[PDB]
Amino acid sequence: MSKKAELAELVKELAVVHGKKEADYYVDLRRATLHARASRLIGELLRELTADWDYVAVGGLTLGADPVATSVMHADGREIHAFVVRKEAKGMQRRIEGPDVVGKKVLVVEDTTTTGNSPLTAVKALREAGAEVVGVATVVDRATGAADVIAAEGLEYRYILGLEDLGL
Amino acid sequence: MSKKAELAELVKELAVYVDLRRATLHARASRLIGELLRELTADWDYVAVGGLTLGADPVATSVMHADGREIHAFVVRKEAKHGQRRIEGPDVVGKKVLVVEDTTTTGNSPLTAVKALREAGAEVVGVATVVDATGAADVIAAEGLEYRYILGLEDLGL
C-alpha cells in the first residue's frame, strides 16, 4: 500500500544522514517520527501491524520510542494510552511515566531496533512494574538478531520497514 | 472555550503533586491539550513545536497530531549523540518555533529549551504551557517572550 510506500519515501528523504559498529551512513528516525506527515503514517501502520494484539497502552524507552508511542495513541481507532520508560532515571518523577500500566496489557514500541537491547530494557522494566507485554513493534528494523533476542523473552517482534525498504 | 472546562476536570481526575504525564499521555486529555494549545497561540507564526525532554514531548506531539495546518515537533535533550542530536526532529535552524511545557513553576524548564533553540539558530515565537508556582510569566518576559497557559490556580482547585 502507498501508506507503507509513502512512509518509506518520507524516511529516505527525511531521515538518511551520510557520514561516519562503524557506519558511514545512519537513519535518525526522529526526523520522521516528529514529522507531521510521517508521524501519522507511523501511527496508523503500527496499529494495523499490531491489530491482533489486545494492548491497552503503548510506549517504550525514552526518546526514540516516545514519538512512535504517541503516534499510535493519536491514531484513529480503539482508545490506547501511552507511557514512557525512563533511561533508569531516579522531586517528582517515576521510571514509567504516564497513565497507570500495573496489571495491564501493554505494547512495546521502538523507532529503530538494532540489538533489541533497547526495547527489552522497556520490557524488563514494564514486567517488573506488573505490566504484561503483548509484544514488540518497531518502525525500522536494522537486520541483527532482534527477533531471536526478543523471541528469547517470549515475545513476537514486528516492524514496518526493513533496510531494503529504505534502499539501505 | 468549552474544551477548556472538559480538560480542567480530566486534569483533576487523572493528574491531581500534579503529574501531568498522566494527562499528557492520556488518549482523551492529550487530544484536548493539542487542540487548546493551537487555539491559545493561533495568532503566532510557527512551523514547529517542542520543549525540554520528557515533560514537553507529549505536549508538542499533541499539537502536531491535532487538526489544522502542518506543525512539526522537536525534543530538546536535557543531557549530553551516541552511536543523535541536541534538538531532535526536523531541522529547527532558521525556523519560527513555539516552546511548550506541561507544567511550569519558576519558568526554568522552558527557558533551558529556549536557550538551546536560540543557540541552534531558531526563532522563539512564545511560550505556552498546559499548567502554570506563579513567578514564571515575568521570567519568560525578561527574555522578551510572551507566556501563555491553559490552566492555572483556581482551575484545579489547587
Short mmCIF file of C-alpha atoms in Angstrom, two decimals:
data_model
loop_
_atom_site.label_atom_id
_atom_site.label_comp_id
_atom_site.label_asym_id
_atom_site.label_seq_id
_atom_site.Cartn_x
_atom_site.Cartn_y
_atom_site.Cartn_z
CA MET A 1 0.00 0.00 0.00
CA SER A 2 1.04 3.62 -0.65
CA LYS A 3 0.77 4.31 3.10
CA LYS A 4 3.73 1.95 3.57
CA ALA A 5 5.29 3.19 0.34
CA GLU A 6 4.76 6.84 1.30
CA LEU A 7 6.38 6.27 4.71
CA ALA A 8 9.49 4.65 3.15
CA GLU A 9 9.90 7.59 0.74
CA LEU A 10 9.46 10.11 3.56
CA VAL A 11 12.05 8.28 5.68
CA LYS A 12 14.54 8.22 2.78
CA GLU A 13 14.25 11.97 2.11
CA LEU A 14 13.77 12.91 5.79
CA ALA A 15 15.93 10.50 7.78
CA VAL A 16 19.12 9.44 5.95
CA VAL A 17 22.37 11.13 7.12
CA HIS A 18 25.64 10.46 5.23
CA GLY A 19 28.90 10.44 7.13
CA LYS A 20 30.95 8.27 9.51
CA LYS A 21 29.68 -0.58 14.70
CA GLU A 22 31.23 1.93 12.28
CA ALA A 23 28.52 3.08 9.85
CA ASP A 24 29.34 5.83 7.29
CA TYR A 25 25.52 6.42 6.95
CA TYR A 26 22.74 6.25 9.58
CA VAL A 27 18.97 6.82 9.90
CA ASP A 28 17.91 9.20 12.72
CA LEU A 29 14.23 8.38 12.58
CA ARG A 30 13.39 11.28 14.86
CA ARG A 31 13.30 13.44 11.74
CA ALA A 32 10.45 11.22 10.57
CA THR A 33 8.76 10.34 13.90
CA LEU A 34 8.49 14.03 14.87
CA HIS A 35 7.34 14.94 11.34
CA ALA A 36 3.64 15.83 10.97
CA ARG A 37 3.16 13.67 7.86
CA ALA A 38 5.39 10.75 8.76
CA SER A 39 4.17 10.52 12.38
CA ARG A 40 0.59 9.99 11.17
CA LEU A 41 1.81 7.31 8.80
CA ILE A 42 3.69 5.55 11.59
CA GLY A 43 0.67 5.58 13.96
CA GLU A 44 -1.84 4.08 11.52
CA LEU A 45 0.64 1.47 10.21
CA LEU A 46 1.69 0.28 13.70
CA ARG A 47 -1.93 -0.10 14.75
CA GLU A 48 -2.51 -2.36 11.69
CA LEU A 49 0.75 -4.25 12.19
CA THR A 50 -0.34 -4.99 15.80
CA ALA A 51 -4.13 -5.31 15.27
CA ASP A 52 -4.24 -8.89 16.59
CA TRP A 53 -2.79 -7.82 19.98
CA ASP A 54 -5.02 -6.68 22.88
CA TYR A 55 -2.83 -3.98 24.44
CA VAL A 56 -4.29 -1.02 26.30
CA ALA A 57 -1.14 1.17 26.24
CA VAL A 58 1.94 1.83 24.05
CA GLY A 59 5.37 3.13 24.90
CA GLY A 60 8.99 2.26 25.35
CA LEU A 61 12.47 3.56 26.11
CA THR A 62 12.60 7.33 26.33
CA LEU A 63 13.29 9.48 23.39
CA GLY A 64 13.24 7.12 20.40
CA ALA A 65 10.10 5.26 21.39
CA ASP A 66 8.16 8.34 22.66
CA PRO A 67 7.06 9.90 19.33
CA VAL A 68 6.26 6.44 17.95
CA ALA A 69 4.12 5.70 21.04
CA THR A 70 2.06 8.92 20.93
CA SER A 71 1.57 8.48 17.16
CA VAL A 72 -0.23 5.23 17.91
CA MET A 73 -2.23 6.82 20.70
CA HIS A 74 -3.24 9.77 18.43
CA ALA A 75 -4.20 7.49 15.54
CA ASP A 76 -7.87 6.64 14.93
CA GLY A 77 -9.47 3.51 16.37
CA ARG A 78 -9.78 1.94 19.82
CA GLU A 79 -8.53 4.01 22.74
CA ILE A 80 -4.92 3.29 23.58
CA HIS A 81 -2.92 5.39 26.04
CA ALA A 82 0.82 5.92 26.03
CA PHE A 83 3.56 5.65 28.63
CA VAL A 84 7.31 6.44 28.75
CA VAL A 85 10.06 4.23 30.20
CA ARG A 86 12.88 6.43 31.54
CA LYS A 87 16.54 5.53 30.85
CA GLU A 88 16.85 4.44 34.51
CA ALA A 89 16.32 7.99 35.88
CA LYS A 90 15.88 8.45 39.66
CA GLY A 91 11.45 15.88 43.22
CA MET A 92 8.71 14.45 41.01
CA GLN A 93 9.42 11.57 38.61
CA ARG A 94 8.66 7.88 38.02
CA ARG A 95 10.53 5.24 35.98
CA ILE A 96 7.43 4.51 33.86
CA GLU A 97 5.71 7.76 33.11
CA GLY A 98 2.08 8.31 32.11
CA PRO A 99 -1.25 6.63 32.89
CA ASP A 100 -1.12 3.50 35.10
CA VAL A 101 0.27 0.33 33.50
CA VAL A 102 0.12 -2.04 36.53
CA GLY A 103 -1.75 -5.22 35.59
CA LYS A 104 -2.42 -4.04 32.05
CA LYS A 105 -1.62 -5.48 28.62
CA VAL A 106 0.94 -3.25 27.04
CA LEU A 107 2.74 -2.82 23.69
CA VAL A 108 6.42 -2.01 23.40
CA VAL A 109 7.36 0.34 20.56
CA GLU A 110 10.73 1.44 19.30
CA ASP A 111 11.77 3.74 16.46
CA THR A 112 14.90 1.88 15.25
CA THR A 113 15.84 -1.57 16.60
CA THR A 114 19.35 -2.92 16.08
CA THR A 115 20.39 -5.03 19.07
CA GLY A 116 16.89 -5.06 20.56
CA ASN A 117 18.54 -4.38 23.94
CA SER A 118 16.74 -1.01 23.99
CA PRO A 119 13.13 -2.30 23.66
CA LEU A 120 13.97 -5.23 26.01
CA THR A 121 15.01 -2.70 28.68
CA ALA A 122 11.49 -1.30 28.45
CA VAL A 123 10.21 -4.91 28.53
CA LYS A 124 12.20 -5.77 31.68
CA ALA A 125 11.01 -2.60 33.45
CA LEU A 126 7.39 -3.00 32.39
CA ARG A 127 7.25 -6.63 33.50
CA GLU A 128 8.81 -5.57 36.83
CA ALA A 129 6.05 -2.92 37.23
CA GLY A 130 3.46 -5.73 36.87
CA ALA A 131 2.56 -4.94 33.26
CA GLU A 132 2.06 -7.77 30.82
CA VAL A 133 3.86 -7.19 27.48
CA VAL A 134 1.98 -8.34 24.37
CA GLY A 135 4.98 -7.97 22.02
CA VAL A 136 7.47 -5.52 20.46
CA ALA A 137 6.85 -3.40 17.35
CA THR A 138 9.42 -1.08 15.69
CA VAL A 139 9.29 1.36 12.71
CA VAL A 140 12.59 0.34 11.11
CA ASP A 141 14.45 -2.91 11.68
CA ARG A 142 18.25 -2.93 11.32
CA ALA A 143 18.71 -6.63 10.49
CA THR A 144 20.56 -8.07 13.50
CA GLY A 145 19.31 -10.84 15.85
CA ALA A 146 16.46 -8.61 17.02
CA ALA A 147 13.68 -11.20 16.55
CA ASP A 148 15.77 -14.06 18.04
CA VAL A 149 16.68 -11.87 21.04
CA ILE A 150 13.11 -10.58 21.55
CA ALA A 151 11.77 -14.15 20.93
CA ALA A 152 14.05 -15.34 23.74
CA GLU A 153 11.93 -13.39 26.24
CA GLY A 154 8.76 -14.95 24.82
CA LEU A 155 7.83 -12.04 22.60
CA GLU A 156 6.91 -11.54 18.97
CA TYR A 157 8.82 -8.89 17.10
CA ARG A 158 7.36 -6.92 14.20
CA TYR A 159 8.46 -3.92 12.13
CA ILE A 160 7.07 -1.63 9.38
CA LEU A 161 10.32 -1.20 7.43
CA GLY A 162 13.49 -3.19 6.74
CA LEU A 163 16.69 -1.65 5.38
CA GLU A 164 15.80 -2.98 1.90
CA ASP A 165 12.53 -0.98 2.03
CA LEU A 166 14.69 2.09 2.54
CA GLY A 167 17.33 1.20 -0.11
CA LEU A 168 19.86 0.86 2.69
CA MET B 1 -13.62 27.78 25.17
CA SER B 2 -15.73 24.78 26.23
CA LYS B 3 -12.99 22.16 25.71
CA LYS B 4 -11.03 24.03 28.42
CA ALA B 5 -13.53 23.01 31.12
CA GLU B 6 -13.50 19.38 30.00
CA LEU B 7 -9.70 19.28 30.35
CA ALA B 8 -9.76 21.00 33.75
CA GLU B 9 -11.95 18.15 35.04
CA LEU B 10 -9.81 15.45 33.33
CA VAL B 11 -6.57 17.04 34.66
CA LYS B 12 -8.08 16.79 38.16
CA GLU B 13 -9.37 13.23 37.75
CA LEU B 14 -6.11 11.93 36.22
CA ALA B 15 -3.26 14.30 37.17
CA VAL B 16 -4.03 15.73 40.62
CA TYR B 17 1.71 16.78 43.29
CA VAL B 18 0.22 17.41 39.83
CA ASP B 19 1.75 14.77 37.48
CA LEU B 20 0.62 15.97 34.03
CA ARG B 21 2.27 12.98 32.38
CA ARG B 22 -0.91 11.18 33.46
CA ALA B 23 -2.96 13.60 31.34
CA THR B 24 -0.46 14.37 28.57
CA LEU B 25 -0.03 10.64 27.87
CA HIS B 26 -3.78 10.02 28.18
CA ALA B 27 -5.70 9.49 24.91
CA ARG B 28 -8.51 11.96 25.60
CA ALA B 29 -6.78 14.61 27.69
CA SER B 30 -3.82 14.85 25.27
CA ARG B 31 -6.21 15.45 22.34
CA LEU B 32 -7.90 18.29 24.23
CA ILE B 33 -4.41 19.71 25.05
CA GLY B 34 -3.17 19.69 21.46
CA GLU B 35 -6.36 21.37 20.24
CA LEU B 36 -6.28 24.01 23.01
CA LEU B 37 -2.60 24.98 22.52
CA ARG B 38 -3.22 25.60 18.85
CA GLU B 39 -6.16 27.88 19.68
CA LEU B 40 -4.32 29.64 22.52
CA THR B 41 -1.41 30.50 20.16
CA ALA B 42 -3.32 30.86 16.86
CA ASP B 43 -2.03 34.41 16.34
CA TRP B 44 1.59 33.19 16.38
CA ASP B 45 3.61 32.16 13.33
CA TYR B 46 5.44 28.83 13.93
CA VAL B 47 6.30 25.78 11.90
CA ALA B 48 7.43 23.54 14.78
CA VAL B 49 6.63 22.91 18.49
CA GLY B 50 8.64 21.35 21.27
CA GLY B 51 10.42 21.95 24.58
CA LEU B 52 12.70 20.21 27.14
CA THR B 53 12.54 16.45 27.26
CA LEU B 54 10.03 14.24 28.84
CA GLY B 55 7.58 16.83 30.15
CA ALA B 56 7.23 18.84 26.95
CA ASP B 57 7.36 15.93 24.48
CA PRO B 58 3.78 14.56 24.74
CA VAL B 59 2.57 18.18 24.75
CA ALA B 60 4.36 19.08 21.48
CA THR B 61 3.25 15.83 19.85
CA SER B 62 -0.36 16.62 20.96
CA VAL B 63 -0.07 19.86 18.99
CA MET B 64 1.36 18.11 15.94
CA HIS B 65 -1.43 15.48 15.87
CA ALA B 66 -4.31 17.94 16.34
CA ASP B 67 -6.27 19.32 13.35
CA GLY B 68 -5.12 22.32 11.36
CA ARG B 69 -2.01 23.40 9.48
CA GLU B 70 1.19 21.29 9.44
CA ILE B 71 3.27 21.89 12.59
CA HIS B 72 6.29 19.61 13.18
CA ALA B 73 7.70 18.78 16.59
CA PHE B 74 11.08 18.60 18.27
CA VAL B 75 12.71 17.47 21.53
CA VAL B 76 15.37 19.36 23.49
CA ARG B 77 17.59 16.85 25.23
CA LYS B 78 18.47 17.82 28.79
CA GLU B 79 21.63 15.64 28.87
CA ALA B 80 24.58 15.08 26.52
CA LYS B 81 24.79 11.99 20.01
CA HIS B 82 25.91 8.44 20.97
CA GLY B 83 26.16 5.81 18.19
CA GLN B 84 21.80 11.53 17.99
CA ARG B 85 21.30 15.34 18.15
CA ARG B 86 20.90 18.18 20.70
CA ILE B 87 17.45 19.13 19.47
CA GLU B 88 15.74 16.11 17.91
CA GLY B 89 13.28 16.13 14.97
CA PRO B 90 13.12 18.01 11.66
CA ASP B 91 15.70 20.88 11.42
CA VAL B 92 14.94 23.81 13.71
CA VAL B 93 17.62 26.16 12.35
CA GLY B 94 16.18 29.42 10.95
CA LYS B 95 12.63 28.40 11.82
CA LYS B 96 9.94 30.19 13.80
CA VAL B 97 9.28 27.94 16.78
CA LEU B 98 6.85 27.50 19.71
CA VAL B 99 8.30 26.35 23.08
CA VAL B 100 5.85 24.27 25.15
CA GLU B 101 5.86 22.77 28.64
CA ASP B 102 3.50 20.57 30.57
CA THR B 103 3.81 22.25 33.97
CA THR B 104 5.98 25.33 34.65
CA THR B 105 6.78 26.63 38.12
CA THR B 106 9.63 29.19 38.03
CA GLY B 107 9.93 29.31 34.23
CA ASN B 108 13.18 27.37 34.42
CA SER B 109 12.49 24.31 32.22
CA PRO B 110 11.10 26.08 29.13
CA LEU B 111 13.98 28.58 29.39
CA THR B 112 16.50 25.74 29.06
CA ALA B 113 14.75 24.82 25.80
CA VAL B 114 14.66 28.49 24.72
CA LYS B 115 18.39 28.87 25.42
CA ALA B 116 19.11 25.73 23.35
CA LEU B 117 16.92 26.80 20.41
CA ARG B 118 18.45 30.27 20.23
CA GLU B 119 21.93 28.67 20.01
CA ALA B 120 20.55 26.22 17.41
CA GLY B 121 19.62 29.31 15.41
CA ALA B 122 15.86 29.10 15.81
CA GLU B 123 13.36 31.93 16.37
CA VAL B 124 11.28 31.50 19.54
CA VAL B 125 7.75 32.72 18.98
CA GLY B 126 6.44 32.42 22.54
CA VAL B 127 6.00 30.00 25.44
CA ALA B 128 2.75 28.08 26.02
CA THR B 129 2.24 25.75 28.99
CA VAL B 130 -0.65 23.37 29.89
CA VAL B 131 -0.45 24.26 33.60
CA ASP B 132 1.10 27.46 35.02
CA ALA B 133 4.23 28.35 41.26
CA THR B 134 3.40 31.81 39.90
CA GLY B 135 6.71 33.57 39.06
CA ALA B 136 7.06 32.17 35.51
CA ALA B 137 5.45 34.87 33.33
CA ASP B 138 7.87 37.58 34.48
CA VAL B 139 10.87 35.28 33.92
CA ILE B 140 9.80 34.49 30.35
CA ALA B 141 9.02 38.19 29.71
CA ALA B 142 12.57 39.11 30.76
CA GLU B 143 13.75 37.03 27.78
CA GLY B 144 11.44 39.13 25.57
CA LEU B 145 8.88 36.34 25.08
CA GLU B 146 5.13 36.13 25.70
CA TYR B 147 4.00 33.38 28.03
CA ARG B 148 0.56 31.76 27.93
CA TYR B 149 -1.17 28.85 29.67
CA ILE B 150 -4.30 26.70 29.58
CA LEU B 151 -4.83 26.06 33.33
CA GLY B 152 -3.52 27.80 36.43
CA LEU B 153 -4.54 28.08 40.06
CA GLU B 154 -8.31 28.18 40.60
CA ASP B 155 -8.98 25.76 37.68
CA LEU B 156 -7.81 22.63 39.53
CA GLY B 157 -8.88 23.98 42.94
CA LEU B 158 -5.23 23.69 43.97
#
